[PDB]
Design a protein around this ligand. Structure first.
Ligand SMILES: O=C(O)[C@@H](CO)O[C@H]1O[C@H](CO)[C@@H](O)[C@H](O)[C@@H]1O
Ligand SMILES: [Mg+2]
Lengths: 252, 250
């Protein structure tokens, strides 16, 4: 069994700390059950949380492995090997300019904004904001609700894909949480262990995750996606409940 | 006679310079008629156009005089004396953050954006956008259509004023082209010379300028505001025209 989990609003509390899901992760770690973050966050944000690879960043844009992963794949980055699944940020940013032309209205994302500005929009510290700005694949859009339909049509018109992560829309090309999970499972050095995948998530960007795994659990505040298991409380209390009530039984 | 003039689409053609107004200006120089730019542009922007003080920047927020101006006014600042008429940019930005809270929604302006973002927004080059970002009095806002009214209400609730500059909204406190014009005329060395003032402008954004001068001329695309003269062709072709029709014969 492998557990793939979203970070923001699933394994992380409202501020951005792992605290409340610590004992839940403890149990899995003690049972030797691999837990893999699959998140909209950047590699720099993930690293600051102290998390080790493997993990998947930027909505499936990038898969980061340990340098000594027994299956050779991706390119060296000192301590990592990186598998790129999506277009690079620079290319998305260029295609967004074309979209803005079509929409006839500015389309701003993090790349347009100062760290100070990002920090005010997101409630992050200035330093955390600099890390959220260090994007390699996916752009976070800052859109007015009234213009969303127009902007999203302009994205698709120029060949970009969009998704929504809880508070912000994102644009990318080839970044899908499900595709990245599928790749990692195929690169897993123990086929048996990767036979059964569990996926936990809370927003739109997690739908492709729920299709890529064998047991899907929704911990968001809405009602669950079609035929997906749900929990009594959202968030980390949801994560804890799922581990104790859905997973452990299957591991005994 | 003193000539007060907007730069956008008045002296400056669509390209960014002034073709047809060039001889019109040299002529004015010949008869010793002072010309004073009155603009939404920053001092850095105005200097890059190679313009000399006196001039009025940021919609009337600041009056820049030659350091050796015969009338002592303003605070010395290198080769300039500066008369500040408006709240400083940093104070405007602080108030904008209160307005965001009242409005319950983000309010973005140039101060939040990179120069590259500003350039793409305005059609300027990166280096010109850095100059546009060096604001001392007023903020340029990047608002969306449906939230504009909530935001404007919020701005006025926290003590700011707003204007529409043609492309974007602007927020400031105390910046008014008319007030800066009235102040410069009061600080003019030769009072007889400041007695007759002409104003040439684009858009209704120059209506405060039109009110502070004795002869107002509109060279925009729309219909001239009530009580303002108009020209056939807009831009520096209207400046040129207005100068040989209204001015040169004096
Ligand atoms: O879409 C959002 O709601 C979140 C979570 O999905 O992602 C963005 O927003 C987060 C901040 O809330 C950033 O930390 C991420 O890097 C990303 O920019
Ligand atoms: Mg999430």
């Amino acid at each position: 069994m492998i557990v793939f989990t979203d970070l923001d609003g699933t394994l992380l509390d409202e501020r951005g700390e792992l605290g409340p899901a610590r004992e839940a992760l403890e149990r899995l770690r003690a049972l030797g059950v691999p837990v893999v973050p699959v998140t909209a966050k950047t590699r720099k944000e993930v690293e600051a949380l102290g998390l080790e690879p493997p993990f998947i960043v930027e909505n499936g844009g990038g898969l980061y492995l340990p340098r000594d992963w027994p299956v050779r794949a991706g390119r060296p980055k000192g301590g990592y090997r990186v598998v790129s699944l999506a277009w690079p940020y620079r290319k998305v940013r260029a295609r967004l300019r074309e979209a803005e032309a079509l929409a006839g209205r500015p389309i701003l994302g993090y790349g347009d904004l100062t760290a100070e500005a990002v920090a005010r929009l997101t409630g992050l510290s200035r330093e955390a904001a600099r890390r959220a700005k260090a994007r390699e694949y996916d752009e976070t859009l800052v859109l007015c609700p009234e213009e969303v339909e127009a902007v999203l049509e302009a994205l698709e018109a120029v060949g970009l894909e969009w998704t929504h992560g809880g508070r912000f829309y994102h644009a990318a090309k080839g970044a899908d949480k499900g595709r990245a999970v599928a790749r990692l499972r195929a690169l897993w050095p123990d086929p048996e262990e990767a036979r059964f995948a569990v996926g936990l998530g809370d927003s739109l960007n997690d739908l492709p995750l729920f299709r890529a795994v064998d047991l899907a659990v929704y911990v968001g505040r809405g009602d669950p996606p079609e035929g997906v298991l749900a929990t009594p409380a959202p968030g980390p209390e949801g994560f804890r409940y799922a581990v104790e009530r859905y997973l452990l039984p299957r591991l005994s």
